[PDB]
């Protein structure tokens, strides 16, 4: 059921979709460990994903959530990374794309910087980095994030010092680092519906000059 789209880099929504991995690169505590040493990417391809019954079963528990939400969908574009991103595409979120061992709980998260996202493309801490060369800052294996149509309703907000339930009356988590200033929120949502993979974005990292 799932068709991808290519967009055109001439394409203003190639150019924002973009705009919106290279601006929300930042500095990670771990030197780059988990996600490789960068400050910007090179895109290779961003392709639209197209499943008539992943999109209706999104806006079916977006309307759903709305409602409980004083008419409020709370409706996020946000980062994700995964070795199952290929998984993801054809058949959903679900239970098995879930951090069981999460600061914010046994839920799907979800990234506003794109680097974040990036240092789970090979797994959890990076796992083992690429499958050809085993670099967790490999500059040659193309990689691939999601960039998805996420349904916040009432966000729980959690600061940190950076499948579950939500919160009694709450739709999802708001992971907001309190430490690092420069670090931007991340959400967890615990139902796969909250959420619809529409960019698949391909790319790799750039080695610093
Ligand atoms: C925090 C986070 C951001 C993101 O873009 N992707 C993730 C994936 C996971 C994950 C969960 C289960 C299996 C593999 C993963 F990479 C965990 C946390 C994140
Ligand atoms: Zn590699």
Same mark, same amino acid.
């Given at each position: 059921?799932?068709? &991808? ?7 203003? !929504? ?9 601006? %929300? ?30 999109? !209706?079963?999104? %806006? ?7 409602? !409980? ?8 574009? &946000? ?5 199952? +991103?290929?998984?993801? #595409? ?9 951090? #069981?061992? *999460? ?8 990234? !506003?910087? =794109? =680097?974040? =996202? ?5 797994? #959890? *801490?990076?796992?083992?980095?690429? @499958? +050809? ?6 500059? $040659?294996?193309?990689?691939? &994030?999601?960039?998805?149509? +996420? ?14 339930? =939500? ?9 907001? @680092? ?9 959400? +967890?949502?615990?139902? *796969? ?7 698949? $974005? %391909?790319?790799?990292?750039?080695? @610093?000059?």
């Amino acid at each position: 059921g799932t068709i &991808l789209i290519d967009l055109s880099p001439d394409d203003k !929504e190639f150019q924002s979709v973009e705009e919106e991995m290279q601006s %929300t690169v930042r500095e990670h505590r771990d030197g780059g460990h988990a996600g490789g040493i960068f400050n910007r990417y090179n895109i290779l391809k961003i392709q639209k994903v197209c499943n008539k019954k992943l999109w !209706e079963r999104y %806006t079916h528990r977006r309307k759903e959530v709305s409602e !409980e939400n004083h008419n409020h969908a709370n409706e996020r574009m &946000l980062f994700h990374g995964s070795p199952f +991103v290929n998984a993801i #595409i054809h058949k959903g979120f679900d239970e098995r794309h879930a951090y #069981i061992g *999460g600061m914010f709980g046994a839920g799907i998260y979800f990234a !506003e910087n =794109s =680097s974040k =996202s990036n240092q789970y493309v090979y797994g #959890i *801490g990076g796992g083992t980095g690429c @499958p +050809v060369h085993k670099d967790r800052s490999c500059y $040659i294996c193309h990689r691939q &994030l999601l960039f998805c149509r +996420v349904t916040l309703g009432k966000s729980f907000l959690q600061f940190s010092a950076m499948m579950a339930h =939500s919160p009694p009356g709450h739709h999802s988590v708001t992971g907001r @680092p309190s430490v690092n200033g420069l670090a931007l929120a991340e959400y +967890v949502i615990y139902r *796969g519906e909250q959420a619809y993979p529409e960019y698949l $974005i %391909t790319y790799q990292i750039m080695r @610093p000059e």
